């Protein structure tokens, strides 16, 4: 029963092993969980719309809230979870969602009311609402407007612009903030201590620095570093270099070579060095980000050069965000910034 769950969690990757089960495990998204804890004692949970960067804990927060609300018994009877792996057209929204909303709430047991608040409403959550078409979204308007007495709607998305304006107005907007080093160092250190991850001083803070506001990627990188340090068995501590090696970060010397080729060099030398660099597998997004950090941070370039480098890096990132060829985009970016 519970022991099987404990063992399955212990044999699970750290992303799912340390998933927040209660509203207190949320480390940084405090403004939303404060309201969620206050409404736990009341019974006026409004329709909610979670939006923010990926890996901020929206799904974990709503799961912990539904748990703390309904208990592990009513967790499976008063919840309608619809993900992006299911059909969510107009037909589905009109039939299934509306039939579940029109239905009455299931009767709680005697053990439920003694430990959990058991609100008189159920919860219908729609994860990854970006893939929902606007007509199927507008179909949900009156469905969530008239049956609010018996069901509550929780939308979850990454881009709040993909959801129509009426739905965004009907739901309370909860913006999840990026999890940088400051507001996630406590959670990362807790995960490291619970797994006996022996690292150096500036490793964890560096990991989140590579994560760029993503605790899931940081936990995955920490798990990979711990596995790589346990395989060696040397008993030493994990270093920031070993972490940034497996994180896809280009070494500093290779980036300085690119800066030298951009500063001094013609089209042919730059093209040859780019062709050689693309042989070693590096993500073009990470290279663009590192070049942006170096160029904007270095206090040795003119402001007129800085405006142009910022606009060129922005254009290159916008083009790379569409599935383009990394080699062509990187070569074009380096050539355009070399003419400056």
């Amino acid at each position: 029963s519970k022991l099987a769950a404990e063992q399955s969690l212990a044999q699970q990757p750290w992303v799912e092993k340390y998933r927040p089960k209660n509203l207190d495990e949320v480390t940084a998204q405090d403004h939303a969980v404060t309201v969620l804890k206050k409404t736990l004692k009341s019974a006026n949970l409004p329709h909610m719309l979670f939006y923010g960067p990926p890996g901020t804990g929206k799904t974990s927060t709503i799961l912990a809230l539904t748990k703390e609300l309904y208990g592990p018994d009513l967790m499976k009877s008063r919840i309608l979870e619809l993900n992006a792996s299911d059909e969510r057209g107009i037909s589905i929204v009109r039939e299934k969602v509306k039939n579940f909303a029109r239905l009455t709430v299931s009767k709680p047991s005697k053990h439920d009311l003694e430990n959990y608040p058991c609100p008189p409403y159920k919860i219908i959550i729609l994860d990854e609402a970006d893939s929902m078409t606007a007509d199927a979204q507008s179909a949900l308007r009156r469905t969530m407007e008239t049956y609010s007495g018996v069901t509550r709607f929780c939308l979850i998305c990454n881009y709040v612009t993909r959801i129509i304006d009426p739905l965004a107005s009907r739901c309370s907007k909860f913006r999840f903030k990026a999890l940088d080093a400051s507001n996630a160092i406590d959670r990362l250190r807790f995960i490291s201590e619970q797994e006996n991850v022996k690292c150096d001083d500036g490793v964890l803070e560096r990991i989140l620095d590579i994560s760029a506001g993503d605790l899931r990627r940081g936990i995955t990188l920490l798990q990979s570093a711990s596995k790589g340090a346990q395989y060696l068995g040397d008993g030493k501590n994990i270093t920031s270099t070993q972490v940034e090696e497996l994180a896809g970060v280009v070494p500093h010397d290779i980036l300085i070579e690119i800066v030298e080729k951009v500063k001094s060099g013609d089209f042919d030398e730059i093209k040859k060095y780019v062709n050689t660099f693309m042989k070693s597998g590096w993500s073009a997004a990470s290279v663009v980000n590192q070049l942006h950090e170096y160029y904007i941070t270095n206090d040795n370039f003119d402001t007129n050069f800085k405006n142009q480098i910022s606009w060129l890096l922005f254009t290159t990132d916008s083009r790379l965000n569409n599935g383009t060829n990394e080699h062509i985009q990187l070569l074009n970016l380096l050539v355009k910034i070399s003419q400056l």
Binding site: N99, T104, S106
Partner: protein, 254 residues
């Protein structure tokens, strides 16, 4: 609480067959003198109203009325387990989230039990029945079904006209026109085949054939059907039960 045991699951199944298709949501209410149920279609032209007295049951206990709403389709989906001869017991607490249907065979053997999820419906039972109708008539329900099934093919509207000693059903559409004329008569060789008519005022009303077709289903509950018509209100088609009745109120056309 709700505790109603039907001798034969078949009676309840035929009753629900009557609400079937023409309505989606039904609001039941059990009380000290029995069970009532009302359902109105989306366009609000048809009301299906049921009344089952305490005596229609093999066992009925009620110390506290309970009102419960449910999806008709869900109910019928479950209403084919009665074996017809099975015993059926409807059960619910005073503040239900579900309705329990319990089918059992005479012997302890097989027990099929269902727990149907309820819907919350604002309690608002209508009381649109009239004291007097312009005209009243009863005739075998199988005859009424045939009359409706005939005319239906010709039009989406079937007119019922009543004059002294004459009842006339008429349909007129694309392929042509049709009419069925019946006259009152007492058959002593068996009065369940007689056709009675009491006319206080001639009437002439038109109904949507699609609705009359829904209504004829009541034939399975009673040998005769009573039809009460008025120019002031919805028409009443009634199918009597032993201690009870199933009524269909249908609003005339314009």
């Amino acid at each position: 609480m709700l505790e109603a045991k039907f001798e034969e699951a078949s009676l309840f199944k035929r009753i629900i067959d009557g609400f079937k298709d023409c309505v989606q949501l039904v609001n039941f209410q059990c009380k000290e003198d029995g069970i009532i149920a009302q359902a109105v279609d989306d366009s609000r032209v048809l009301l299906v109203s049921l009344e089952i007295g305490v005596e229609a049951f093999q066992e009925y206990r009620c110390d506290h009325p309970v009102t419960l709403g449910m999806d008709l389709t869900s109910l019928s989906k479950i209403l084919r387990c009665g074996n017809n001869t099975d015993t059926l017991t409807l059960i619910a607490d005073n503040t239900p989230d579900s309705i329990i249907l319990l089918f059992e065979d005479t012997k302890k053997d097989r027990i099929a039990e269902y727990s149907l999820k309820l819907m919350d419906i604002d309690a608002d039972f209508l009381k649109i029945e009239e004291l007097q109708y312009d005209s009243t008539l009863s005739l075998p329900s199988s005859e009424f079904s045939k009359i409706v099934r005939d005319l239906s093919q010709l039009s989406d509207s079937i007119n019922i006209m009543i004059t002294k000693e004459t009842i006339k059903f008429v349909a007129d559409g694309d392929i042509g026109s049709g009419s069925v004329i019946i006259k009152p008569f007492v058959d002593m060789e068996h009065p369940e085949t007689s056709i009675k008519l009491e006319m206080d005022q001639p009437v002439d009303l038109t109904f949507g054939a699609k609705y009359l077709l829904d209504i004829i289903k009541g034939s399975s509950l009673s040998d005769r059907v009573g039809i009460r018509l008025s120019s002031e209100a919805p028409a009443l088609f009634q199918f009597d039960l032993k201690s009870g009745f199933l009524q269909f109120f249908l609003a005339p056309k314009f």
